[PDB]
Design an enzyme around this catalytic site. Structure first.
Site, PDB file in Angstrom:
ATOM      1  N   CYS A  93     -14.559 -12.990   3.662  1.00 26.32           N
ATOM      2  CA  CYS A  93     -13.952 -11.657   3.627  1.00 26.32           C
ATOM      3  C   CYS A  93     -14.856 -10.593   4.262  1.00 26.32           C
ATOM      4  N   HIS A 106       7.698  13.184  -5.270  1.00 25.21           N
ATOM      5  CA  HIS A 106       8.353  13.592  -4.029  1.00 25.21           C
ATOM      6  C   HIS A 106       7.471  14.565  -3.255  1.00 25.21           C
ATOM      7  N   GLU A 144      -1.546 -10.675  11.918  1.00 29.81           N
ATOM      8  CA  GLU A 144      -2.406  -9.504  11.813  1.00 29.81           C
ATOM      9  C   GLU A 144      -3.244  -9.334  13.073  1.00 29.81           C
ATOM     10  N   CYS A 159     -11.299  -9.990   5.483  1.00 29.44           N
ATOM     11  CA  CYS A 159     -10.556  -8.786   5.077  1.00 29.44           C
ATOM     12  C   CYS A 159     -11.157  -7.499   5.639  1.00 29.44           C
ATOM     13  N   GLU A 181       8.633   6.427  -4.015  1.00 25.67           N
ATOM     14  CA  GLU A 181       9.648   6.904  -4.962  1.00 25.67           C
ATOM     15  C   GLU A 181      11.017   6.256  -4.748  1.00 25.67           C
ATOM     16  N   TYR A 193      -0.398 -15.300   8.220  1.00 24.54           N
ATOM     17  CA  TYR A 193      -0.702 -13.871   8.211  1.00 24.54           C
ATOM     18  C   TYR A 193      -1.900 -13.548   9.107  1.00 24.54           C
ATOM     19  N   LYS A 217     -11.006  -7.279   9.684  1.00 24.93           N
ATOM     20  CA  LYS A 217      -9.562  -7.276   9.955  1.00 24.93           C
ATOM     21  C   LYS A 217      -8.955  -5.888   9.721  1.00 24.93           C
TER      22      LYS A 217
HETATM   23  C1  LIG Z   1      -9.000 -13.728   8.827  1.00 30.79           C
HETATM   24  C2  LIG Z   1      -8.920 -13.644   7.324  1.00 30.79           C
HETATM   25  C3  LIG Z   1      -8.423 -12.488   6.724  1.00 30.79           C
HETATM   26  C4  LIG Z   1      -8.346 -12.379   5.332  1.00 30.79           C
HETATM   27  N1  LIG Z   1      -7.851 -11.202   4.783  1.00 30.79           N
HETATM   28  C5  LIG Z   1      -7.792 -11.113   3.460  1.00 30.79           C
HETATM   29  C6  LIG Z   1      -7.263  -9.890   2.878  1.00 30.79           C
HETATM   30  O1  LIG Z   1      -6.869  -8.898   3.498  1.00 30.79           O
HETATM   31  N2  LIG Z   1      -7.241  -9.899   1.482  1.00 30.79           N
HETATM   32  C7  LIG Z   1      -7.656 -10.938   0.660  1.00 30.79           C
HETATM   33  O2  LIG Z   1      -7.565 -10.793  -0.565  1.00 30.79           O
HETATM   34  N3  LIG Z   1      -8.134 -12.091   1.219  1.00 30.79           N
HETATM   35  C8  LIG Z   1      -8.197 -12.161   2.556  1.00 30.79           C
HETATM   36  N4  LIG Z   1      -8.681 -13.321   3.128  1.00 30.79           N
HETATM   37  C9  LIG Z   1      -9.101 -14.414   2.237  1.00 30.79           C
HETATM   38  C10 LIG Z   1     -10.496 -14.209   1.660  1.00 30.79           C
HETATM   39  O3  LIG Z   1     -11.438 -14.016   2.717  1.00 30.79           O
HETATM   40  C11 LIG Z   1     -10.888 -15.447   0.856  1.00 30.79           C
HETATM   41  O4  LIG Z   1      -9.889 -15.713  -0.128  1.00 30.79           O
HETATM   42  C12 LIG Z   1     -12.263 -15.336   0.194  1.00 30.79           C
HETATM   43  O5  LIG Z   1     -13.248 -15.037   1.188  1.00 30.79           O
HETATM   44  C13 LIG Z   1     -12.625 -16.605  -0.546  1.00 30.79           C
HETATM   45  O6  LIG Z   1     -13.915 -16.435  -1.165  1.00 30.79           O
HETATM   46  P1  LIG Z   1     -14.763 -17.676  -1.641  1.00 30.79           P
HETATM   47  O7  LIG Z   1     -15.873 -17.156  -2.562  1.00 30.79           O
HETATM   48  O8  LIG Z   1     -13.864 -18.690  -2.229  1.00 30.79           O
HETATM   49  O9  LIG Z   1     -15.418 -18.254  -0.287  1.00 30.79           O
HETATM   50  P2  LIG Z   1     -16.096 -17.519   0.949  1.00 30.79           P
HETATM   51  O10 LIG Z   1     -15.902 -16.033   0.830  1.00 30.79           O
HETATM   52  O11 LIG Z   1     -15.535 -18.182   2.222  1.00 30.79           O
HETATM   53  O12 LIG Z   1     -17.662 -17.831   0.775  1.00 30.79           O
HETATM   54  C14 LIG Z   1     -18.158 -19.184   0.672  1.00 30.79           C
HETATM   55  C15 LIG Z   1     -19.536 -19.234   1.303  1.00 30.79           C
HETATM   56  O13 LIG Z   1     -20.168 -20.511   1.029  1.00 30.79           O
HETATM   57  C16 LIG Z   1     -20.835 -20.924   2.201  1.00 30.79           C
HETATM   58  N5  LIG Z   1     -21.077 -22.367   2.149  1.00 30.79           N
HETATM   59  C17 LIG Z   1     -20.209 -23.371   2.491  1.00 30.79           C
HETATM   60  N6  LIG Z   1     -20.700 -24.579   2.339  1.00 30.79           N
HETATM   61  C18 LIG Z   1     -21.995 -24.353   1.891  1.00 30.79           C
HETATM   62  C19 LIG Z   1     -23.052 -25.224   1.555  1.00 30.79           C
HETATM   63  N7  LIG Z   1     -22.967 -26.556   1.616  1.00 30.79           N
HETATM   64  N8  LIG Z   1     -24.211 -24.672   1.133  1.00 30.79           N
HETATM   65  C20 LIG Z   1     -24.303 -23.343   1.064  1.00 30.79           C
HETATM   66  N9  LIG Z   1     -23.379 -22.424   1.358  1.00 30.79           N
HETATM   67  C21 LIG Z   1     -22.241 -22.996   1.771  1.00 30.79           C
HETATM   68  C22 LIG Z   1     -19.928 -20.462   3.329  1.00 30.79           C
HETATM   69  O14 LIG Z   1     -20.637 -20.477   4.563  1.00 30.79           O
HETATM   70  C23 LIG Z   1     -19.580 -19.056   2.826  1.00 30.79           C
HETATM   71  O15 LIG Z   1     -20.602 -18.131   3.190  1.00 30.79           O
HETATM   72  C24 LIG Z   1      -8.774 -13.456   4.533  1.00 30.79           C
HETATM   73  C25 LIG Z   1      -9.265 -14.611   5.132  1.00 30.79           C
HETATM   74  C26 LIG Z   1      -9.341 -14.717   6.520  1.00 30.79           C
HETATM   75  C27 LIG Z   1      -9.882 -15.979   7.142  1.00 30.79           C
HETATM   76  C1  LIG Z   2       6.210  25.855  -1.817  1.00 31.29           C
HETATM   77  C2  LIG Z   2       6.803  24.860  -2.783  1.00 31.29           C
HETATM   78  C3  LIG Z   2       6.484  23.509  -2.659  1.00 31.29           C
HETATM   79  C4  LIG Z   2       7.032  22.556  -3.525  1.00 31.29           C
HETATM   80  N1  LIG Z   2       6.667  21.226  -3.363  1.00 31.29           N
HETATM   81  C5  LIG Z   2       7.173  20.343  -4.183  1.00 31.29           C
HETATM   82  C6  LIG Z   2       6.798  18.955  -3.996  1.00 31.29           C
HETATM   83  O1  LIG Z   2       6.039  18.532  -3.121  1.00 31.29           O
HETATM   84  N2  LIG Z   2       7.393  18.080  -4.908  1.00 31.29           N
HETATM   85  C7  LIG Z   2       8.278  18.442  -5.929  1.00 31.29           C
HETATM   86  O2  LIG Z   2       8.740  17.559  -6.664  1.00 31.29           O
HETATM   87  N3  LIG Z   2       8.627  19.757  -6.088  1.00 31.29           N
HETATM   88  C8  LIG Z   2       8.093  20.653  -5.250  1.00 31.29           C
HETATM   89  N4  LIG Z   2       8.437  21.987  -5.408  1.00 31.29           N
HETATM   90  C9  LIG Z   2       9.391  22.341  -6.475  1.00 31.29           C
HETATM   91  C10 LIG Z   2      10.844  22.176  -6.038  1.00 31.29           C
HETATM   92  O3  LIG Z   2      11.087  22.955  -4.866  1.00 31.29           O
HETATM   93  C11 LIG Z   2      11.773  22.675  -7.146  1.00 31.29           C
HETATM   94  O4  LIG Z   2      11.405  22.084  -8.392  1.00 31.29           O
HETATM   95  C12 LIG Z   2      13.268  22.435  -6.872  1.00 31.29           C
HETATM   96  O5  LIG Z   2      13.666  22.905  -5.578  1.00 31.29           O
HETATM   97  C13 LIG Z   2      14.131  23.086  -7.930  1.00 31.29           C
HETATM   98  O6  LIG Z   2      15.497  22.649  -7.769  1.00 31.29           O
HETATM   99  P1  LIG Z   2      16.683  23.468  -8.404  1.00 31.29           P
HETATM  100  O7  LIG Z   2      18.023  22.764  -8.145  1.00 31.29           O
HETATM  101  O8  LIG Z   2      16.278  23.674  -9.825  1.00 31.29           O
HETATM  102  O9  LIG Z   2      16.657  24.900  -7.610  1.00 31.29           O
HETATM  103  P2  LIG Z   2      16.577  25.328  -6.073  1.00 31.29           P
HETATM  104  O10 LIG Z   2      16.214  24.154  -5.223  1.00 31.29           O
HETATM  105  O11 LIG Z   2      15.704  26.563  -6.009  1.00 31.29           O
HETATM  106  O12 LIG Z   2      18.119  25.715  -5.685  1.00 31.29           O
HETATM  107  C14 LIG Z   2      18.803  26.823  -6.312  1.00 31.29           C
HETATM  108  C15 LIG Z   2      19.727  27.417  -5.271  1.00 31.29           C
HETATM  109  O13 LIG Z   2      20.675  28.320  -5.890  1.00 31.29           O
HETATM  110  C16 LIG Z   2      20.740  29.501  -5.117  1.00 31.29           C
HETATM  111  N5  LIG Z   2      21.252  30.594  -5.950  1.00 31.29           N
HETATM  112  C17 LIG Z   2      20.534  31.439  -6.758  1.00 31.29           C
HETATM  113  N6  LIG Z   2      21.268  32.321  -7.396  1.00 31.29           N
HETATM  114  C18 LIG Z   2      22.561  32.039  -6.976  1.00 31.29           C
HETATM  115  C19 LIG Z   2      23.811  32.614  -7.288  1.00 31.29           C
HETATM  116  N7  LIG Z   2      23.966  33.638  -8.132  1.00 31.29           N
HETATM  117  N8  LIG Z   2      24.914  32.088  -6.700  1.00 31.29           N
HETATM  118  C20 LIG Z   2      24.765  31.057  -5.866  1.00 31.29           C
HETATM  119  N9  LIG Z   2      23.642  30.434  -5.499  1.00 31.29           N
HETATM  120  C21 LIG Z   2      22.568  30.977  -6.087  1.00 31.29           C
HETATM  121  C22 LIG Z   2      19.326  29.676  -4.571  1.00 31.29           C
HETATM  122  O14 LIG Z   2      19.257  30.594  -3.480  1.00 31.29           O
HETATM  123  C23 LIG Z   2      19.028  28.223  -4.173  1.00 31.29           C
HETATM  124  O15 LIG Z   2      19.597  27.878  -2.915  1.00 31.29           O
HETATM  125  C24 LIG Z   2       7.920  22.974  -4.535  1.00 31.29           C
HETATM  126  C25 LIG Z   2       8.238  24.325  -4.657  1.00 31.29           C
HETATM  127  C26 LIG Z   2       7.692  25.272  -3.790  1.00 31.29           C
HETATM  128  C27 LIG Z   2       8.069  26.723  -3.934  1.00 31.29           C
END
Ligand SMILES: Cc1cc2nc3c(=O)[nH]c(=O)nc-3n(C[C@H](O)[C@H](O)[C@H](O)COP(=O)(O)OP(=O)(O)OC[C@H]3O[C@@H](n4cnc5c(N)ncnc54)[C@H](O)[C@@H]3O)c2cc1C
Ligand SMILES: Cc1cc2nc3c(=O)[nH]c(=O)nc-3n(C[C@H](O)[C@H](O)[C@H](O)COP(=O)(O)OP(=O)(O)OC[C@H]3O[C@@H](n4cnc5c(N)ncnc54)[C@H](O)[C@@H]3O)c2cc1C
Ligand SMILES: CC(=O)N1CCC(NC2CC2)CC1
Ligand SMILES: CC(=O)N1CCC(NC2CC2)CC1
Ligand SMILES: CC(=O)N1CCC(NC2CC2)CC1
Ligand SMILES: CC(=O)N1CCC(NC2CC2)CC1
Lengths: 588, 588
Positions: free
Chosen positions: A149, A566, A295, A154, A571, A291, A157
């Protein structure tokens, strides 16, 4: 049967103190061992449910029933007064260091599982040695401590994946108002490799420092188990010697396979070579469809390479095949070419690799399709990704009696024990287990706690989540759709699904209906979530948290009553409602 | 029990059919309704636990006990023979349309909650009107259908955040081997605004299309409830009229607040104006410290702006204060200036805004720190983010009898009912509820189902996860650390925490120990996870899935037995072990 737990714990531990949290005679023994730089396990009996019965069974070894009680390698040492007698008589260091073997633990293999096992055991006073060696590839590639790894898996990669993702970030930045022109930017392969290899070097060095600071002996050496308690080690200059250990952990991992065809070993490379390659591969052929194959092909195309994948049968065998096909369709649409139902026959060399000027050679690949038609085309680099295998003949003597299966992997009990009672195996060489780096780390840490601190927790290998880091990433946890149907029947399976579009893709003018997710559920078990699947950006981050809910038995109603965050991609899992049986389209 | 549910369901449903899945006469009635484009709810009695009791209770309404039975607005219409008779005789359409009121439902407000409630109700045959109006800001800004989030909230805020994130992506790309030079790239504000507003316009249009396709009447009008069933509507041209509805849903949301100081309304702006501002703000002062203030200060700085935030007391009041301080420390290190313990006294105009040449004006801001020292500095733009409030005096005649609390929000039962039995409220104006878009959507959909389809599921407002989209994002779910200690006491609370570095930050040479995550747990309840907090990239994707596990009662042991996905940031949650009480350092 508390007695046979206590017997196994006392037998196997190196230094262990039975204690209570409020007892100050215990505290005086603790502070003495701390000042003496003596590490040990501690079992606080007022914190365990049946600590009362345990106290009684300690008399079977020590003839006393009070606390504290210190043991060393299966022998009772004394109460408070006796331990302090040894300390001020300077006899204590000789008593804790007295052992029948050189080491309490010898780990063969210094990768993900092995390093984790060895450090954890040293925390509890186990005298530990970690052996590691890297056999070079056919062209001579080698690397440092840390395993597959860290050096050739890993870590490099995903860094190279990130380099590919940034090309789409540069395109996106124009639409978001930045003044750059993506068509006039290019990529430098060797600059990236230098940065990647520099990070890997910091990890090689950190692991050496880690072992030193835990008082673990690191031997750079090829290990071979010749008898239950004897390990023969061979030096860089071919010097041979023997060390002995009480417990043995095999953790030597795997290496890539080559197909048995002319030219492959001579003129091809594997992933072992790709991550330190000193020249850009150029026009590349990737052979295989695991994989690793997908990759590697994916980031090479994203860095501007000319990339072909040759597929014997299907993509991602063993993964959900609907998902696998969406993965490959995305790749085909973004510049990767596929030669489907195809197989290689030979590699001919046309041009030798130019080491001096940092240039690939040139090769001619000959092959054929399943119908009979022939394949013939030139490539600068050919990469084999056709599986990996262990090489335990180099590690184990047949006479020791460790049972292997027909693939060459070690047959283990559910606590990693082999057929030889003091020898265990972890990681990719453990038969039937998922071959993933966090699995090997958990296996190794939990095993070390059982051997040296009296723990009982086992590793749970079920429902382990995965992520494939293709250009569009694919996370999964649990059963594929086809595995669920086959296990429970099609009328007992309900599937909820939906396309989606990341908000980030709107202003960037990316595709409307390629990202996708589904939940595979069991009707007769309260709509239990059997598998979760998602194709989209940041799929590993999306998937991980749901793995906890699935471990806990999540149902569809659990997903429904949870509220979304959101705006996110994730979500969309909280409001799924379209079923496959309904025939309603999943598009947005 | 069952009888009170049936009476409620029959009384308020518009068109409802009582049925069984295997009932060939029920199928006969379904086909006639489908062929006549009559939308209706359906309850399949065999799929319900106590369908036998329900079937017997129906006779109290119809004097029969077989299925199918069809009802319209509380009146039994007939069995299959009688329904076919009305169909054949051309009498069915006028029967299903007969009503005491113009509409079965009137939704006042066309935002997140109201649009969701209206569409869901129409699905079950409810005759529905959705009313929406946008009161212009003091400088005249206005926008289209869809509410605060769509037009001036989550959607344009996260698009602009993404524009900010891309500036660091451009920097990172050099280190990964790409040839661009970040120092010669600039950002064009009006180009980004045009792309954002194009997306918003496609959403304004998509909602009008969706209401049309669901047979919902859309009135662009200002609504006023003058009695329990009468809504006065005022025209774009000032024409007034009155419509009647059986059920009323209030969903009018909130608008930004201004401090009562000279020059604030005349020369400053709010977030309502920012997302379509035709010119770059330039040197900008943000007054306030909510998530709105910090998110806007954050992306403005990443887009090259000279930005100051004037903080009355603390950042992010009501969020975990350790996390708030890490959020602000990161912003201060990446260019945002803070004027702490400071309040504004007046805004003075030095230059008028130049609409023609598309340039901001110039202002002098005067204020004072809490110790009495003076604040005085010039800015081109001053944004007020000092809270939001409803304006229900414009919506709700006093004599109607709908009770409000002291902040002017509507006091509701746990099923969203107000003090007037046919009037409900949802979204930001429902007192005491989380003010978030997915919450308003869940509440509106669930309510519509209870009113018109016999459903009983209530919305769960507890433990709803959030994400603050500052330059380094902050995701959370459950209690802050100080709230948990206040509620259970410090000795019953254990906190596990760790720093981490994203793998993508290594080759890019970003900070080692800035990202951070913690689990707040209760010792006496099996180490139950009370709160989860994470500061790092993709914090919303990271957090969402854990929210299902928390909903289910996850403990620390459930996080330990789950295996990580590697390499991810999120996997760090599965191996946490350093406690705050241990005093051990959380760095890596
Ligand atoms: C290209 C690639 C990508 C991967 N990507 C991921 C990933 O994204 N996520 C993930 O979870 N896993 C990934 N894996 C898998 C992960 O690398 C292995 O599951 C993990 O390394 C296994 O660990 P290990 O301790 O069993 O052996 P290893 O990590 O292989 O270590 C064993 C060691 O023992 C040594 N050894 C061998 N024989 C002897 C000996 N006789 N005397 C002394 N030392 C010895 C070897 O040389 C080695 O250094 C990937 C594998 C590959 C090949
Ligand atoms: C800058 C900002 C960023 C935000 N970012 C996030 C975020 O990332 N994630 C998140 O989950 N929430 C976020 N929020 C909160 C989210 O916008 C509100 O919780 C949500 O819009 C409220 O929904 P609502 O239906 O209660 O009211 P609103 O969406 O405010 O809708 C009410 C509507 O009724 C209208 N209205 C009012 N009075 C009347 C009337 N008398 N007659 C007719 N229509 C009327 C209004 O003009 C409006 O169009 C953010 C809020 C702000 C201000
Ligand atoms: C075969 C053998 O005797 N060994 C090989 C590993 C070497 N480790 C060096 C001392 C740090 C030396 C020991
Ligand atoms: C084929 C080859 O060159 N190797 C085998 C002997 C190895 N000795 C280990 C490093 C202590 C070195 C690697
Ligand atoms: C009677 C009144 O004042 N209303 C104002 C808003 C109008 N919108 C619909 C399309 C015409 C509805 C009528
Ligand atoms: C009902 C409607 O659409 N109106 C248009 C604009 C509303 N407010 C502007 C400031 C005068 C007033 C009424």
């Amino acid at each position: 049967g508390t007695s046979q737990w206590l017997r196994k714990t006392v037998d196997s531990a190196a230094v262990i103190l039975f204690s209570k949290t409020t007892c100050p005679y215990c505290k005086k023994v603790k502070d003495v061992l701390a000042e003496a730089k003596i590490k040990h396990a501690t079992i606080e009996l007022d914190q365990l449910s049946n600590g009362s019965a345990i106290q009684k069974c300690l008399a079977s070894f020590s003839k006393i029933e009070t606390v504290p009680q210190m043991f060393v390698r299966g022998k009772f040492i004394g109460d408070s007064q006796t331990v302090l007698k040894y300390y001020s008589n300077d006899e204590l260091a000789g008593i804790v260091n007295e052992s029948k073997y050189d080491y309490d633990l010898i780990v063969i293999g210094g990768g993900s599982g092995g390093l984790a096992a060895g450090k954890e055991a040293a925390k509890y006073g186990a005298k530990t040695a970690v052996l590691d060696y890297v056999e070079p590839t056919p062209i001579g590639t080698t690397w440092g401590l840390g395993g597959t790894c860290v050096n050739v898996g890993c870590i490099p990669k995903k860094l190279m994946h990130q380099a590919g993702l940034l090309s789409h970030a540069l395109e996106d930045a124009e639409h978001f108002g930045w003044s750059l022109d993506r068509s006039k930017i290019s990529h430098n392969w060797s600059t990236m490799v230098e940065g990647v290899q520099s990070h890997i070097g910091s990890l090689n060095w950190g692991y050496k420092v880690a072992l030193r600071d835990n008082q673990v002996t690191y031997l750079n050496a090829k290990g071979r188990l010749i008898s239950p308690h004897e390990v023969q080690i061979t030096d860089k200059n071919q010097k041979v010697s023997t060390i002995t250990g009480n417990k043995i952990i095999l953790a030597t991992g795997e290496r890539p396979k080559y197909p048995e065809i002319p030219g492959a070993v001579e003129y091809g490379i594997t992933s072992d070579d790709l991550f330190s390659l000193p020249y850009f591969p150029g026009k590349t052929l990737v052979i295989g469809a695991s994989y690793v194959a997908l990759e590697c092909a994916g980031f090479l195309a994203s860095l501007g390479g000319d990339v072909t994948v040759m597929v014997r049968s299907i993509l991602l065998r063993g993964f959900d095949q609907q998902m696998a096909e969406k993965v490959g369709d995305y790749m085909e649409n973004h510049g990767v070419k596929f030669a489907k139902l195809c197989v290689p026959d030979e590699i001919k060399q046309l041009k030798v690799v130019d080491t001096e000027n940092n240039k690939p050679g040139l090769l001619l690949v000959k092959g054929h399709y399943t119908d009979g038609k022939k394949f013939e085309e030139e490539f600068e680099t050919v990469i084999f990704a056709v599986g990996r295998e262990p090489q335990l003949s180099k590690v184990l003597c047949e006479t020791v009696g460790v049972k292997l299966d027909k693939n060459g992997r070690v047959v283990c009990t559910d606590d990693e024990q082999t057929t030889v009672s003091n020898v265990y195996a972890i990681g990719d060489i453990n038969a039937g287990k998922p071959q993933l780096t966090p699995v090997a780390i958990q296996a190794g840490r939990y095993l070390a706690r059982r051997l040296f601190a009296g723990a009982t927790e086992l590793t749970d290998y079920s429902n382990v989540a995965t992520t494939v880091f293709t250009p569009l990433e694919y996370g999964a946890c649990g059963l594929s759709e086809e595995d669920a149907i086959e296990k429970y029947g099609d009328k007992d399976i309900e599937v909820y699904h939906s396309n989606f579009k990341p908000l980030e893709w709107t202003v960037a003018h990316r595709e409307d209906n390629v990202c996708y997710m589904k939940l595979v559920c069991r009707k007769s078990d309260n709509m239990r979530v059997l598998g979760l699947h998602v194709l989209g950006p940041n799929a590993g981050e999306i998937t991980q948290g749901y793995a906890v809910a699935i471990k806990m038995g999540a149902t569809k109603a659990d997903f429904d009553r949870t509220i979304g965050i959101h705006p996110t991609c994730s979500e969309t899992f909280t409001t799924l409602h379209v079923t496959k049986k309904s025939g309603v389209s999943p598009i947005v």
